Design a protein around this ligand. Structure first.
Ligand SMILES: *[C@@H]1O[C@H](CO)[C@@H](O[C@@H]2O[C@H](CO)[C@@H](O)[C@H](O)[C@H]2NC(C)=O)[C@H](O)[C@H]1NC(C)=O
Ligand SMILES: CC(C)C[C@H](N)C(=O)O
Ligand SMILES: [Cl-]
Ligand SMILES: [Zn+2]
Ligand SMILES: [Zn+2]
Length: 301
């Protein structure tokens, strides 16, 4: 049972950090990430893409001056490893930011083309960029934030939340104190929203999540995003936040749109950068940044 701030406590600091977000870094990383034929978790393709992604995280770390920050693989029974990047803070209360790094072509999983641009390359470059900007803060890079922050890049999500299943089950066993988890899975597709004349917005998934955290998540989107929220259900174990919920951890899920307006190109060769709106991905970078900062600096957690 975990409770959160009623309202944002570091508006000025987060707003200044938001100005450091470089919209060009999304496509820079997303373009080569989507060039792997697929990132199938059972496949050597997914192994190679995981290693490539780990290198890109490491470059952000090496370039940051943050002496204590690490990135490590998390082996699974399949070739594609998950990746956990740790920003250690004063306490062991941990804030997790999630995306999944695999992709699938449901008609030909082993060999089919799956650029996975929106599902879920968009969430990977979203939280990778918020991670980079987070380390430009002196106290965060110094390990003086009240709480620990981790960024997770889950292997094997398209096989049934396989990587996050492994990770959170093991966190549960080793008594890891995960006070808040935010999953981001598809953050780029807005053409379904705008084609219907709906205002572009941040989807907020309301099932398989924690109510208090989802409430705080909306608080974060109102302070730090310049678009509204819309509440949606998806009606099943949508994404990796369901693995966190399964082990009693408070989780939330921010989405590109209302669930019925999301990308129809996922799980096929047609999930391409063409379908991705990076100005919307930038909005998810702002809420990721703000969520991570406000909770890293929440003493009452
Ligand atoms: C957070 O701080 C910002 C300033 O960085 C406040 O900015 C308001 O909106 C724009 C910037 O987006 C400014 O030009 C306005 O002057 C501000 N409006 C008002 C009425 O002051 C923003 O209001 C702050 N947010 C909260 C929740 O306090
Ligand atoms: C985020 C949701 C649209 C579901 C997710 N794309 C999946 O792996 O099934
Ligand atoms: Cl609890
Ligand atoms: Zn998917
Ligand atoms: Zn997905």
């Amino acid at each position: 049972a975990v409770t959160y701030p009623d309202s944002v406590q570091h508006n000025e600091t987060v707003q200044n950090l938001i100005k450091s977000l470089d919209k060009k870094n999304f496509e820079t990383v997303l373009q080569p990430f989507s060039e792997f034929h697929n990132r199938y978790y059972k496949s050597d393709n997914g192994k190679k893409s995981s290693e490539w992604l780990q290198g890109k995280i490491q470059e952000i770390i090496s370039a940051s001056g943050a002496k204590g920050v690490t990135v490590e693989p998390f082996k699974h029974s399949f070739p594609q490893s998950s990746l956990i990047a740790k920003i250690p803070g004063k306490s062991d209360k941990t804030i997790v930011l999630g995306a999944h790094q695999d992709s699938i072509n449901l008609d030909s999983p082993s060999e089919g083309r799956a650029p996975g641009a929106d599902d879920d390359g968009s969430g990977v470059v979203t939280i990778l960029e918020a991670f980079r900007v987070l380390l430009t803060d002196e106290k965060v890079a110094a390990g003086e934030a009240p709480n620990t922050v981790e960024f997770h890049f889950y292997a094997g999500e398209e096989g049934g939340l396989l990587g996050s299943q492994d990770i959170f089950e093991q966190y549960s066993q080793k008594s890891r104190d995960v006070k808040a988890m935010l999953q981001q899975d598809m953050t780029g597709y807005t053409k379904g929203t705008t084609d219907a004349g709906k205002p572009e917005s941040i989807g907020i998934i309301t099932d398989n999540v924690d109510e208090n955290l989802t409430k705080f998540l909306k608080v974060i989107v109102d302070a730090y995003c310049t678009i509204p929220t819309v509440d949606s259900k998806c009606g099943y174990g949508c994404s990796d936040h369901a693995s966190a919920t399964k082990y009693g951890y408070p989780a939330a899920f921010a989405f590109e749109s209302a669930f019925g307006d999301d990308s129809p190109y996922i799980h096929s060769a047609d999930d391409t950068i063409e379908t991705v709106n990076f100005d919307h991905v930038l909005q998810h970078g702002r809420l990721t940044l703000g969520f991570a900062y406000e909770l890293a600096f929440a003493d009452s957690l």
